[PDB]
């Protein structure tokens, strides 16, 4: 109820028109501020208690950002396009020690998003589903978050089948990329925590705040 895909699509269009690792961390920090402005544009999100808004974002930021630069890199050859306008080629990532995780992003996300031609509306809805993670610990009202999530995928499915009537399995195919997103998210965080530990690799304030406890 009251979860039009048009509003979700608008949120996407509104926020987005030498060590590769350092470039990635700087881009993540920059995009974190934008993530907040994007979340605010997602229907009913801002109406949630401030505390729950913090929980949802702290719990989904990495997956939310990974989903965005991955879809943004669909046209890119063998690599990704950072929000800073910089390109990180698969070989550059490999020569920095993050080749394994980088390839997972290209194989499981980038490539797959390209094969099915995932559009911005679908992308936005998937990110909205991630944002509304009912499993996020601390939620003062998990049931409510679960309600918003069901409205998002209810609208997404309607979008599909209607825009792509010929593809009855598109809806499920879209949701079936969430497991990979969760796995890739978790691995990327592990790397970030190691970079922070080693001391090397410059980490900005907002990104550093996200690596805080819990």
């Amino acid at each position: 109820e009251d979860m039009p895909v048009e509003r979700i699509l608008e949120a996407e269009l509104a926020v987005e028109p030498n060590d590769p690792v350092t470039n990635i961390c700087q881009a993540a920090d920059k995009q974190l501020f934008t993530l907040v402005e994007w979340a605010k544009r997602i229907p009913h999100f801002s109406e949630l208690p401030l505390d729950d808004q913090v929980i949802l974002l702290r719990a989904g930021w990495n997956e939310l950002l990974i989903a965005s630069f991955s879809h943004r890199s669909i046209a890119v050859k063998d690599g990704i396009l950072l929000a800073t306008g910089l390109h990180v080629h698969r070989n550059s990532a490999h020569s920095a020690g993050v080749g394994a995780i980088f390839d997972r992003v290209l194989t499981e996300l980038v490539s797959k998003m390209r094969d099915m031609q995932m559009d911005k509306t679908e992308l936005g809805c998937l990110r909205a589903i991630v944002l509304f993670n009912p499993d996020s610990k601390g939620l003062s009202n998990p049931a409510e978050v679960e309600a918003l999530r069901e409205k998002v995928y209810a609208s997404l499915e309607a979008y599909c089948k209607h825009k792509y009537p010929e593809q009855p399995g598109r809806f499920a195919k879209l949701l079936l990329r969430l497991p990979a997103l969760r796995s890739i998210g978790l691995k990327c965080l592990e790397h970030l925590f190691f970079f922070k530990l080693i001391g090397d690799t410059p980490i900005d304030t907002f990104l550093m705040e996200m690596l805080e406890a819990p």
Binding site: V36, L50, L57, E209
Partner: peptide
Amino acid sequence: KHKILHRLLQD
């Protein structure tokens, strides 16, 4: 805690 985040969400 989460100083930056709270501030951005508040505005």
